[PDB]
Amino acid sequence: AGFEGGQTPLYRRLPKFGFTSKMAMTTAEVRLSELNKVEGDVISVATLKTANIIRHDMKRARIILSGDVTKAYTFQGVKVTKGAKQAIEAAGGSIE
């Protein structure tokens, strides 16, 4: 792996770039379709951990418009996108 016969290999011809963030490793994205595994109506970080939607070491979660919700939910400590927010409030939920 990574050898081209003595010619300087592709990964060594190209430059390194970027840095790794630690915030990204504790931020988790939650899809509207995974919300059916939640027990209850409140959608918080603790409830997303209980539903096994997110890892227990995640600190915060984002709700994005991927599937669609089926019931009214209450969101406390999660960021919700614009499309996901309008889908939640169209299905009768709320965000706080």
């Binding site: 990574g2 990964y11 060594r12 190209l14 430059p15 390194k16 970027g18």
Partner: protein, 64 residues
């Protein structure tokens, strides 16, 4: 247990996109006065990894 190891220098060069890999371009580190502004413009940013290089990149970075 034993696992495949990532080539860490290749993981520092290649990142996963939806249908392939992205990368920065060469020939921008230094000696840049002599280069035209077109080359300085166009050698900036990301390119895709070429499909002929993609199997090697997958062998080098088997987890990203």
């Amino acid at each position: 247990k034993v696992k495949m190891k990532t080539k860490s220098g290749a993981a520092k060069r290649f990142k996963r996109t939806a249908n392939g890999f992205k990368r920065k371009q060469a020939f921008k580190s230094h000696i840049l006065t002599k280069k035209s502004s077109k080359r300085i413009r166009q050698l900036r940013g990301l390119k895709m990894v070429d499909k002929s290089d993609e199997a090697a990149v997958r062998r080098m970075c088997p987890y990203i």
